[PDB]
């Protein structure tokens, strides 16, 4: 009998639905459990993505209890569930408590703490805590198992709460992270990045079962509903799906909610930024003649590739673009191989610049910029709105005054700048001199478009670096 088959057996033997009947897992739930636990390579992370109301809470509770007192229970450990809100943490906790108190065989080996959200599986001394990003940071945190609940609600590419849990698991040799969530609405959101990385890499240590209706599928058809709702008829009401599908049809402002929540689709779109052929048509060398010069600086990727772009409109219609790049010296040989880009050759050829260490040293970047801006009277320099004072202080510290203007890295501020840049490329109004590094960034660039029509470049969607294009977008955007 397999490890996964034991979890299933445990859930179906000891877990009772709250009403009355013993829990019977659907094939999609079983197949997910089998894939996680009977992975011969070992599973580090497991993602199951399904539409709303397909039995998430029950499955989370079942798996927790298998680890609390069932066949996965191991001595003196902690297990956690993590959600964004108190409410969500209570829902999972309350369902687990009800399961514990509906079966005397579970009831008789679990102690519940009279404050907080904490269960102890007594036989193996397993502590279970229900956590949320809302409310107090708990002191003792070191989970061998963490189930993240509805992580698709995270809007950034990062979240402090998720990272705290992730970091805490790092104390153990081979911990398990399980994510059960409806997809994020946007391709740039944390869960979308996790799913995409798993799907593109086919990493043997990652399981990723995603149930979604295809993009072009008819929202009123049952086969579209089944594709996103694998529990259609058992846990998920088909009557309710039919009502929500009709509402989506009659209310266009509800369609995106229906698509995300009930068809498990992302509502954003993704495409390449530019073809090499179109890019190459703007590759005549740039000139430096007096004008309003605008700068865009992207230092964000401190371990990979930093970029400054100075650009400005000539007396003809055309924009001349001068890019400068910084990269860490220690990790140059490693990254050349990792990224499959000739960074070594470019540094040697004076087209890429280094900073000592594994990180990009701000001190060395501002020193070069001072030499660079000797040839440019800048009107503005666009920079991350959240890190502008820290860079302004470090620039001022070396005697270098820069006309810094705040520039958002999200969809609202990038949207118009991407549209402007695209429009200039399309009518041949750029001279970039086929700079190899910028060209690499252009060709790697992917653009995510949100539901409101705002476009931005995505470093996670792209294979290889794109940081020159972010700086070029900001540079254009600053006018
Ligand atoms: Br089975
Ligand atoms: Br819902
Ligand atoms: Br749900
Ligand atoms: Br066992
Ligand atoms: Br355990
Ligand atoms: Br509840
Ligand atoms: Br909580
Ligand atoms: Br916490
Ligand atoms: Br939820
Ligand atoms: Br990959
Ligand atoms: Br339902
Ligand atoms: Br798409
Ligand atoms: Br200046
Ligand atoms: Br200045
Ligand atoms: Br923004
Ligand atoms: Br334009
Ligand atoms: Br969106």
Residue numbers in the entry: 1 to 18, 23 to 483
Can you quote the paper on this entry?
A large number of double-stranded DNA viruses, including tailed bacteriophages and herpes viruses, use a homomeric ring ATPase to processively translocate viral genomic DNA into procapsids during assembly. By contrast, pac systems feature imprecise, sequence-independent cleavage of the DNA concatemer during head filling, giving rise to variable genome lengths inside virus particles. Both systems encode a large terminase (TerL) protein, composed of a viral packaging ATPase domain and a nuclease domain, and a small terminase (TerS) protein, which recognises the cos or pac site between genome copies and, upon binding of DNA, recruits TerL to make an initiating DNA cut. Here, we reconstituted in vitro a cos packaging system based on bacteriophage HK97 and provided a detailed biochemical and structural description. Crystal structures of the large terminase and DNA-recruiting small terminase, a first for a biochemically defined cos system, reveal mechanistic similarities between cos and pac systems.
To gain structural insights into the active ATPase of the HK97 system, we determined the crystal structure of the apo HK97 TerL at 2.2 Å resolution. The structure comprises both ATPase and nuclease domains, with the two connected by a short linker and a unique β-strand (red) that is absent in pac TerL proteins. This unique β-strand forms a three-stranded β-sheet with the auxiliary hairpin of the nuclease domain (beige). An additional ααβ element was observed within the nuclease domain relative to pac TerL proteins (blue), possibly serving as a platform for interactions with HNH endonuclease GP74 or simply part of an adaptation of cos TerL proteins towards sequence-specific endonuclease activity. The ATPase core comprises an eight-stranded β-sheet, with six parallel strands and two anti-parallel strands, a topology that is conserved across viral packaging ATPases, which build on the ASCE 51432 topology. The Walker A motif is found between strands β1 and β2. Unlike in lambda gpA, a lysine residue, K60, occurs at the expected position; however, like in lambda, a second lysine residue, K57, occurs N-terminal to the classical position. The Walker B motif resides at the end of strand β6 with catalytic residues D153 and E154. The HK97 TerL nuclease domain has an RNase H-like fold, with residues D302, D388 and D471 at the catalytic center. Residue K463, which follows the hairpin, protrudes into the active site, forming potential salt bridges with D302 and D471 and coordinating a water molecule.
